[PDB]
Amino acid sequence: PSLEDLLFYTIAEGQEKIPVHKFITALKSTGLRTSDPRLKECMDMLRLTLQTTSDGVMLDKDLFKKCVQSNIVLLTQAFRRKLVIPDFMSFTSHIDELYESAKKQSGGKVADYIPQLAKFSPDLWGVSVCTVDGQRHSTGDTKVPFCLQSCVKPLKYAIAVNDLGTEYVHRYVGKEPSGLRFNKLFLNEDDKPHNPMVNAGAIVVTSLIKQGVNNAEKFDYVMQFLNKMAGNEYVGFSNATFQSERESGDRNFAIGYYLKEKKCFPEGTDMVGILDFYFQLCSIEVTCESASVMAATLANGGFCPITGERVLSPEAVRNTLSLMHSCGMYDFSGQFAFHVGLPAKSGVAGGILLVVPNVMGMMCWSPPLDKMGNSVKGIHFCHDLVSLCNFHNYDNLRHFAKKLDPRREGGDQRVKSVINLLFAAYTGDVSALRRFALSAMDMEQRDYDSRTALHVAAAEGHVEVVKFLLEACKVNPFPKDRWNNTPMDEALHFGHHDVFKILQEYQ
Q: Residue 325, interface with its own copies (CB under 8 A)? A: yes
Q: How far is the CB of 150 from ligand 04A (least distance, A)?
A: 19
Q: For the purposes of burial, counting CB atoms within 10 Å of the CB of 82, is it exposed (0-12), middle (13-18) or buried (19 or more)? A: exposed
Question: Cβ closer to ligand 04A: 251 or 474?
Answer: 251
Per rule CB under 8 A, is residue 482 in the interface with its own copies? yes
Quote the least distance from Cβ 308 to its own copies, whole Å: 4
Site for ligand 04A in 116-145 (CB under 6 A): none
267 binds its own copies (CB under 8 A): no
Spatial CA neighbour of 170 closest among 154, 203, 192, 187: 192
**Interface positions, 366-425, toward its own copies (CB under 8 A):** 392-401, 411-412, 415-416, 419-420, 422-425
Strands (E), 132-284: 136-139, 145-147
Question: By CB under 6 A, which span of 64-72, 186-194, 235-243, 475-483 interacts with ligand 04A?
Answer: 186-194
| Contact residue for ligand 04A among 6, 89, 180, 185 (CB under 6 A) | 185
Distance between CA 486 and CA 459 in Å, rounded? Answer: 10
Q: What burial class does residue 403 get, using C-beta atoms within 10 Å of its C-beta: 0-12 exposed, 13-18 middle, 19+ buried?
A: middle
Of 220 and 449, CB closest to its own copies: 449
Using DSSP, state whether 158 is helix, strand or coil.
Answer: helix
Q: CA 100, 102, 106: angle at the middle one, nearest 5?
A: 105
Q: Contact 406/91 with Cβ under 8 angstroms?
A: yes
- Among residues 68, 159, 161, 187, the one that binds ligand 04A under rule CB under 6 A: 187
Q: Would you count residue 242 as binding ligand 04A (CB under 6 A)?
A: no
What is the distance between the alpha carbons of residues 125 and 136, in angstroms, rounded to a whole number? 17
47 binds its own copies (CB under 8 A): no
| Binding residue for ligand 04A, selected from 23, 99, 186, 225, defined by CB under 6 A | 186
Region 63-82 residues binding its own copies, contact defined as CB under 8 A: 69-74, 76, 79-81
Q: Where are the alpha helices (DSSP H) in 230-375?
A: 239-247, 251-261, 271-282, 288-299, 314-327, 333-339
Query: Does residue 216 belong to the site contacting its own copies (CB under 8 A)?
Result: no
**In angstroms, rounded to a whole number, what is the distance separating the alpha carbons of residues 125 and 104?**
9
Q: Which string of x and - marks every residue 189-228 that binds ligand 04A (by CB under 6 A)?
A: x-x-------------------------------------
**Which residues from 245-304 bind ligand 04A, rule CB under 6 A?**
none
Task: Identify which of 414, 419, 426, 422 has the alpha carbon closest to the alpha carbon of residue 462.
Answer: 426
Annotated binding site: 150, 199, 245, 252, 278, 330, 348
> Which positions make up the binding site for substrate?
150, 199, 245, 252, 278, 330, 348
